[PDB]
Design an enzyme around this catalytic site. Structure first.
Site, PDB file in Angstrom:
ATOM      1  N   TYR A  49     -20.428  38.576 -76.288  1.00 46.46           N
ATOM      2  CA  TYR A  49     -19.522  39.126 -75.137  1.00 46.46           C
ATOM      3  C   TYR A  49     -20.231  39.183 -73.929  1.00 46.46           C
ATOM      4  CZ  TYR A  49     -16.424  39.972 -79.190  1.00 46.46           C
ATOM      5  OH  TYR A  49     -15.892  39.915 -80.442  1.00 46.46           O
ATOM      6  N   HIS A 111     -21.038  37.513 -87.450  1.00 45.04           N
ATOM      7  CA  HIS A 111     -19.846  37.232 -86.317  1.00 45.04           C
ATOM      8  C   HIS A 111     -18.898  35.894 -86.819  1.00 45.04           C
ATOM      9  CE1 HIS A 111     -18.664  37.671 -82.023  1.00 45.04           C
ATOM     10  NE2 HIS A 111     -17.411  37.017 -82.561  1.00 45.04           N
TER      11      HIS A 111
HETATM   12  N1  LIG Z   1     -14.766  38.806 -84.615  1.00 48.23           N
HETATM   13  C1  LIG Z   1     -14.100  37.740 -83.767  1.00 48.23           C
HETATM   14  O1  LIG Z   1     -14.337  36.623 -83.857  1.00 48.23           O
HETATM   15  C2  LIG Z   1     -13.308  38.481 -82.925  1.00 48.23           C
HETATM   16  C3  LIG Z   1     -12.209  37.502 -82.095  1.00 48.23           C
HETATM   17  C4  LIG Z   1     -11.455  37.978 -81.112  1.00 48.23           C
HETATM   18  C5  LIG Z   1     -11.433  39.389 -80.927  1.00 48.23           C
HETATM   19  N2  LIG Z   1     -12.119  40.067 -81.446  1.00 48.23           N
HETATM   20  C6  LIG Z   1     -12.305  41.745 -81.137  1.00 48.23           C
HETATM   21  O2  LIG Z   1     -10.939  41.767 -81.087  1.00 48.23           O
HETATM   22  C7  LIG Z   1     -10.527  42.567 -79.850  1.00 48.23           C
HETATM   23  C8  LIG Z   1      -8.986  42.470 -79.537  1.00 48.23           C
HETATM   24  O3  LIG Z   1      -8.869  41.091 -79.401  1.00 48.23           O
HETATM   25  P1  LIG Z   1      -8.608  40.237 -78.070  1.00 48.23           P
HETATM   26  O4  LIG Z   1      -9.468  40.837 -77.055  1.00 48.23           O
HETATM   27  O5  LIG Z   1      -8.696  38.934 -78.576  1.00 48.23           O
HETATM   28  O6  LIG Z   1      -6.778  40.531 -77.809  1.00 48.23           O
HETATM   29  P2  LIG Z   1      -6.002  41.663 -77.862  1.00 48.23           P
HETATM   30  O7  LIG Z   1      -6.259  42.951 -77.979  1.00 48.23           O
HETATM   31  O8  LIG Z   1      -4.868  41.066 -78.891  1.00 48.23           O
HETATM   32  O9  LIG Z   1      -5.221  41.546 -76.366  1.00 48.23           O
HETATM   33  C9  LIG Z   1      -5.865  41.896 -75.105  1.00 48.23           C
HETATM   34  C10 LIG Z   1      -5.062  41.451 -74.141  1.00 48.23           C
HETATM   35  O10 LIG Z   1      -3.865  42.395 -74.006  1.00 48.23           O
HETATM   36  C11 LIG Z   1      -3.852  43.229 -72.778  1.00 48.23           C
HETATM   37  N3  LIG Z   1      -3.096  44.499 -73.069  1.00 48.23           N
HETATM   38  C12 LIG Z   1      -3.940  45.564 -73.889  1.00 48.23           C
HETATM   39  N4  LIG Z   1      -2.932  46.432 -73.939  1.00 48.23           N
HETATM   40  C13 LIG Z   1      -1.768  46.144 -73.568  1.00 48.23           C
HETATM   41  C14 LIG Z   1      -0.652  46.735 -73.562  1.00 48.23           C
HETATM   42  N5  LIG Z   1      -0.419  48.050 -73.936  1.00 48.23           N
HETATM   43  N6  LIG Z   1       0.453  46.236 -72.883  1.00 48.23           N
HETATM   44  C15 LIG Z   1       0.165  45.065 -72.400  1.00 48.23           C
HETATM   45  N7  LIG Z   1      -0.748  44.217 -72.231  1.00 48.23           N
HETATM   46  C16 LIG Z   1      -1.774  44.946 -72.889  1.00 48.23           C
HETATM   47  C17 LIG Z   1      -5.200  43.052 -72.324  1.00 48.23           C
HETATM   48  O11 LIG Z   1      -5.019  43.379 -70.912  1.00 48.23           O
HETATM   49  P3  LIG Z   1      -6.007  44.182 -69.896  1.00 48.23           P
HETATM   50  O12 LIG Z   1      -7.394  44.348 -70.605  1.00 48.23           O
HETATM   51  O13 LIG Z   1      -6.038  43.711 -68.499  1.00 48.23           O
HETATM   52  O14 LIG Z   1      -5.065  45.802 -69.912  1.00 48.23           O
HETATM   53  C18 LIG Z   1      -5.779  42.068 -72.692  1.00 48.23           C
HETATM   54  O15 LIG Z   1      -5.381  40.631 -71.819  1.00 48.23           O
HETATM   55  C19 LIG Z   1     -11.731  41.768 -78.982  1.00 48.23           C
HETATM   56  O16 LIG Z   1     -11.602  42.124 -77.657  1.00 48.23           O
HETATM   57  C20 LIG Z   1     -12.751  41.852 -79.666  1.00 48.23           C
HETATM   58  O17 LIG Z   1     -13.285  43.245 -79.910  1.00 48.23           O
HETATM   59  C21 LIG Z   1     -13.021  39.665 -82.324  1.00 48.23           C
END
Ligand SMILES: NC(=O)c1ccc[n+]([C@@H]2O[C@H](COP(=O)([O-])OP(=O)(O)OC[C@H]3O[C@@H](n4cnc5c(N)ncnc54)[C@H](OP(=O)(O)O)[C@@H]3O)[C@@H](O)[C@H]2O)c1
Length: 316
Positions: A49, A111
């Site tokens: 990241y 990962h």
């Molecule tokens: N192990 C892996 O391969 C892997 C892959 C993907 C993700 N992950 C982990 O999982 C985490 C979460 O997944 P993700 O980042 O893909 O996406 P997510 O958490 O599903 O969505 C994040 C998005 O939603 C928005 N958001 C957050 N809270 C909100 C709310 N209450 N209302 C409206 N919009 C909202 C955020 O905007 P803002 O930030 O602009 O507020 C951002 O654009 C990652 O950050 C990472 O830590 C791991």
């Protein structure tokens, strides 16, 4: 709803954490500070990241301020694919520890099951665009992860983006010393993961749901893609409960005995997303949300589809 789940290493893991993928380095320090101030005790990180230094600034400041004690935090990171080699795992973990300002991780994950050629590039490519694999098999990577437990660098080890057969390969490893504590996989109403979740849970492996909101900021988003936050059927469940759609999407995995890691850098949303311990979805709500499955992935790992350990050819 208790706030923590018991892992198979005997430690407790907060069921709600803050995600940090795509959190800009100039915003993630404040995001993590706010998160800790409003109650989060679990941060999900990764070397790939490129923002662990800035996450670490926030953690260290909150420890120094005595807002929290280190034992109250649950910090997770992940070994990137270009470090699957026996001789590189410890240094990769230590770089993460040094960036996060920590002397141990609560959980360290492989990962992806795919190892790539070491070097500066996170996706080393051949001249035709395919990722260049490493020959290190994943069982050997697992043995290297076990060493990290035995050296005190990490309290727990686990896996991410492993399919059923790959989890089974770890569990069937000759001489296995520590079982995976966690498998972190994509999971939300459009990718409900019943088969893989049931398998992992039946083996005592806790599942963490990533992209629970459908990752609206994923770099490859297209207008025509399905949108969880805008799905009127989910909005209707939220309205019935006097909660936001995001709050329903976070509570959903919690009631499946999953850990969930929504990402935000917006202070108001960081706070909103934490207010999920004071309402319950009915069984009918849960089954209704499960019915929205369409096997849709935010994270299909498109830059490693040619690798022999690519996880998403298999049904689950
Ligand atoms: N192990 C892996 O391969 C892997 C892959 C993907 C993700 N992950 C982990 O999982 C985490 C979460 O997944 P993700 O980042 O893909 O996406 P997510 O958490 O599903 O969505 C994040 C998005 O939603 C928005 N958001 C957050 N809270 C909100 C709310 N209450 N209302 C409206 N919009 C909202 C955020 O905007 P803002 O930030 O602009 O507020 C951002 O654009 C990652 O950050 C990472 O830590 C791991």
């Amino acid at each position: 709803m208790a706030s923590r789940i018991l892992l198979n290493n005997g430690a407790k893991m907060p069921i709600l954490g803050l995600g940090t993928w795509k959190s800009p380095p100039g915003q993630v320090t404040e995001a993590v500070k706010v998160a800790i101030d409003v109650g989060y005790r679990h941060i999900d990180c990764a070397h790939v990241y490129q923002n662990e230094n800035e996450v670490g600034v926030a953690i260290q400041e909150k420890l120094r301020e005595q807002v929290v004690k280190r034992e109250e935090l649950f910090i997770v990171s992940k070994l990137w694919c270009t470090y699957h080699e026996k001789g590189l795992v410890k240094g990769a973990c230590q770089k993460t520890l040094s960036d996060l300002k920590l002397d141990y991780l609560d959980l360290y994950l492989i990962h992806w099951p795919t190892g790539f050629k070491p070097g500066k590039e996170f996706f080393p490519l051949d001249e035709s665009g395919n990722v260049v694999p490493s020959d290190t098999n994943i069982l050997d990577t697992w043995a290297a992860m076990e060493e990290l437990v035995d050296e005190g660098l990490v309290k727990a080890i686990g896996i991410s983006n492993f399919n059923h057969l790959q989890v089974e390969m770890i569990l069937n490893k000759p001489g296995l010393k520590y079982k995976p504590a966690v498998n972190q996989i994509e999971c939300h109403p459009y990718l409900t993961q019943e088969k893989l979740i049931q398998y992992c849970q039946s083996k005592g492996i806790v599942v963490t749901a990533y992209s629970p909101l459908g990752s609206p900021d994923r770099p490859w988003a297209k207008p025509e893609d399905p949108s969880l936050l805008e799905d009127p059927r989910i909005k209707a469940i939220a309205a019935k409960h006097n909660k936001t759609t995001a709050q329903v999407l976070i509570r959903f995995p919690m009631q499946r005995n999953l850990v969930v890691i929504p990402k935000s850098v917006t202070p108001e949303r960081i706070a909103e997303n934490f207010k999920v311990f004071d309402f319950e979805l009915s069984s009918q709500d849960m089954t209704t949300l499960l019915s929205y499955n369409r096997n849709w992935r935010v994270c299909a790992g498109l830059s490693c589809t040619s690798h022999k350990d690519y996880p998403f050819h298999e049904e689950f």
